[PDB]
């Protein structure tokens, strides 16, 4: 049973600039001290990503519908583990098979099944004033799950569940991709010491898991854990956190490794001409000079066909609209020769009961070259 | 499963016995593309994808890569490279029932051809005329799905063939499936023929001081050649001019 969430104040979506963030390992092949250029689905450098807040202060409970075009980069700034997971699918009404990820304390439970997802799926942690302790209270995400086989297990330990005071201290970076029947989740964790910003620097994104599911995903949600301590449908505390959503596109990136196996730096080839010439030279340092990198060319706007006009017209009107027609035994034949034909002349009137054509059919093939026409 | 609803199963994290298939010889078609047959199929793959369907005998040819037909463009297509095998056998006793069995279906008509791999389960009425028909069977609009109707006394072209199409991804980086033929043998510091993921080669195994990652199996240096493999280093034995 899910409860509709009310007492929410509408506010236009916010956007922020992500700086050289969202670069992962293109393959599972070890490389070191080599400049590798690879084309794959990556987040563009210096792009815009959508920002969603959750501030106690309304309460800014952000969990709308977000598209899944070709992969999603999900960054999460947290200090109390508000975000608990995600759900993926196409309709989220148990009509089509869906997926859900949840960091439950007892076990991580990636469920791939047909769930009757409600309007506002969420989690809720109860707070007790008698003694300092936080425990999971409500879990209102799905109602039915019948047609499926996949279910998983893992071993997480009891986490905090308490809402600490201060600024964000944890950054969780994720990339979800759906290609070749695979749902790849790439993850990284970083300690950050800001208040409300997007962390700088560059960090590699190691592969966490590659689920072999193979389902159709178009729309996805975000799962938040709220806090409680009047009405249950309309009353909740959000807890302070934020998360960033971005979309990957197919781009070519040049990556520079180190003596270790990590990725230390990367550049987007199609960002600016400086990075274009850096990619062209296969180096991160460009000496002074002039370099030919690309080749500009005007793409044709449309296709034009001009042919000779109709000048000789076949006397189908003579045959069809003739005053006198022959008897069946004395079948009359006329040869239609050396004229273009208005094949758009035998059904538009449709006086004819039958325009039943055999082999040629009423189509463009009709309105095409004919060696001889016998009427 | 039927050709339109081509069932897929994942062969993961197990050793495989490709040679029981080769030595069975009862399968009507056991054609393999890219991979070699006659006991050379027992090489490691990242994923072994099995898709099984019951098709007509005459339509077996269309399953091949770059071939065209009704099944190929409306039910099941294969990628042009197709590193894998096509396996078929005649299920006339098992999959033909007296008076015909109509439990197997092929998509006679569809608006467009499919992607290299695609499972269309839609029952939306195919449109052949101006009229929409409101998704009901009328003139110039019929059910896209059409039955087979295998009969016990019928032609070999008209008898059911159970078909398992096996695709083999040759990236080899995960190494989930691997022939149980090789062994470890504790060999190092000698010119030997290394073999760790079904990629054969020659050279001297060497202790490795570099650090890999749990998701990393192979390591390739400059020239995109195998250098380190799950951790052992590959250094070819001494050679030169005389």
């Amino acid at each position, epitope marked *: 049973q899910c409860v509709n969430l009310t007492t929410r104040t509408q506010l236009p979506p916010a956007y922020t600039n992500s700086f050289t963030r969202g670069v992962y390992y293109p393959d599972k092949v070890f490389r070191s001290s080599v400049l590798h250029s690879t084309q794959d689905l990556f987040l563009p450098f210096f792009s815009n990503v959508t920002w969603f807040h959750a501030i106690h202060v309304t309460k800014r409970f952000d969990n709308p519908v977000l598209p899944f075009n070709d992969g999603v980069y999900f960054a999460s700034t947290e200090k109390s583990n508000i975000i608990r997971g995600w759900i993926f699918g196409t309709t989220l009404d148990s009509k089509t098979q869906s997926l859900l990820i949840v960091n439950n304390a007892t076990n991580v439970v990636i469920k791939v099944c047909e769930f009757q997802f409600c309007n506002d799926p969420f989690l809720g942690v109860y707070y007790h004033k008698n003694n300092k302790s936080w425990m999971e209270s409500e879990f209102r995400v799905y109602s039915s799950a019948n047609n499926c086989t996949f279910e998983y297990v893992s071993q997480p330990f009891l986490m905090d569940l308490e809402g600490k005071q201060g600024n964000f201290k944890n950054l969780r970076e994720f990339v979800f991709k759906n290609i070749d029947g695979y749902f790849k989740i790439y993850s990284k964790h970083t300690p950050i010491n800001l208040v409300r910003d997007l962390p700088q620097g560059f960090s590699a994104l190691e592969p966490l898991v590659d689920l072999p599911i193979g389902i159709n995903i178009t729309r996805f949600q975000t799962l938040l854990a709220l806090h409680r301590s009047g009405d249950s449908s309309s009353g909740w505390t959000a807890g302070a956190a934020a998360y960033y959503v971005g979309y990957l596109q197919p781009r070519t990136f040049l990556l520079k490794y180190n003596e270790n196996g990590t990725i230390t730096d990367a550049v987007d080839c199609a960002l600016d001409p400086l990075s274009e010439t850096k990619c062209t030279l296969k180096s991160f340092t460009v000496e002074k000079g002039i370099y030919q990198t690309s080749n500009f060319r005007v793409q044709p706007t449309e296709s034009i066909v001009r042919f000779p006009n109709i000048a000789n017209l076949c006397p189908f009107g003579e045959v069809f609209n003739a005053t006198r027609f022959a008897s069946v035994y004395a079948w009359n034949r006329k040869r239609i020769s050396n004229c273009v034909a208005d094949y758009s002349v035998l059904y538009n009137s*449709a006086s004819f009961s039958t325009f039943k054509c055999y082999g040629v059919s009423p189509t463009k093939l009709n309105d095409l070259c004919f060696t001889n026409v016998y009427a | 499963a039927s050709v339109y609803a081509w069932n897929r199963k994942r062969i993961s994290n197990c050793v495989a016995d490709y040679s029981v298939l080769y030595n069975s010889a009862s399968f009507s078609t056991f054609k393999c593309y890219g991979v070699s047959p006659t006991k050379l199929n027992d090489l490691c793959f990242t994923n072994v994808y099995a898709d099984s369907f019951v098709i007509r005998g005459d339509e077996v040819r269309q399953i091949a890569p770059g071939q065209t037909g009704k099944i190929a463009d409306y039910n099941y297509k294969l990628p042009d490279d197709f590193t894998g095998c096509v396996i078929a056998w005649n299920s006339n006793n098992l999959d033909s029932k007296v008076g015909g069995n109509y439990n197997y279906l092929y998509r006679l008509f569809r608006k467009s051809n499919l992607k290299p791999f695609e499972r269309d389960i839609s029952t939306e009425i195919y449109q052949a005329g101006s*009229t929409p028909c409101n998704g009901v*069977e009328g*003139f110039n609009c019929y*059910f896209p799905l059409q039955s087979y109707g295998f009969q016990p006394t019928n032609g070999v072209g008209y008898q059911p063939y159970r078909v398992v199409v096996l695709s083999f991804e040759l990236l080899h980086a995960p190494a989930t499936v691997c022939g149980p033929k090789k062994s470890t043998n504790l060999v190092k510091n000698k010119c030997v023929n290394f073999n760790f993921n079904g990629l054969t080669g020659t050279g001297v195994l060497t202790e490795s001081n570099k650090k890999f990652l749990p998701f990393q199996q192979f390591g390739r240096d400059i020239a995109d050649t195998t250098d380190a493999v799950r951790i052992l280093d590959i250094t070819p034995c001494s050679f030169g001019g005389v």
Partner: antibody
Amino acid sequence: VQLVQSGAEVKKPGSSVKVSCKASGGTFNTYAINWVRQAPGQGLEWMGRIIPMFGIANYAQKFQGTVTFTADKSTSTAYMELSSLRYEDTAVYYCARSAYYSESSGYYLDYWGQGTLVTVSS
Amino acid sequence: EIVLTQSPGTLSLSPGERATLSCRASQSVSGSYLAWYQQKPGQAPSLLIYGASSRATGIPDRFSGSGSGTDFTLTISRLEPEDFAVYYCQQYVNSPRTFGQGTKLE
């Protein structure tokens, strides 16, 4: 081959009913089932069709939202649900066969059941 | 929506002669998607014909269709007393399989 029909229903106005057309072996999977109203002292009206393999039911504009078609793959029985008995809904509903195919484009009613008489009473 | 009008509503009048039952439609029946039906009183209709003229199993070929375009014919070559029954038409062209109003109703 035989599609026996449910008996006459004693339904007070506004009270829902569900008919029980029973398919013989091999009828549902191969062939569609269609419902015709056959209103008293009047003609035949096509309510819709049931595809008993893919569970597809499509209705005419008139009967949309007023009637529900269901069929049971196991036990091979066809069901039609009336939302409530409106006063004009009195009739003799009939269940018949169909082709629902491409190669055979004749979508005619092969075999008709005995019929069910719904009314205010008996 | 293709309406069908049967033209001889009560021409039969306990007929002892060959008949010319008719059906006409607003848009021409495409590809002979028509059928006829035998609704004996107190019983369900029985298929009499499909296509334009294709006969039926267990129905004698004395029942003869003769239609094209606006498909319109059901011809009883030699009339028999038991065959008397309101005869219905039905079109599978575009229409939600609509029927006519019946030609041999008392």
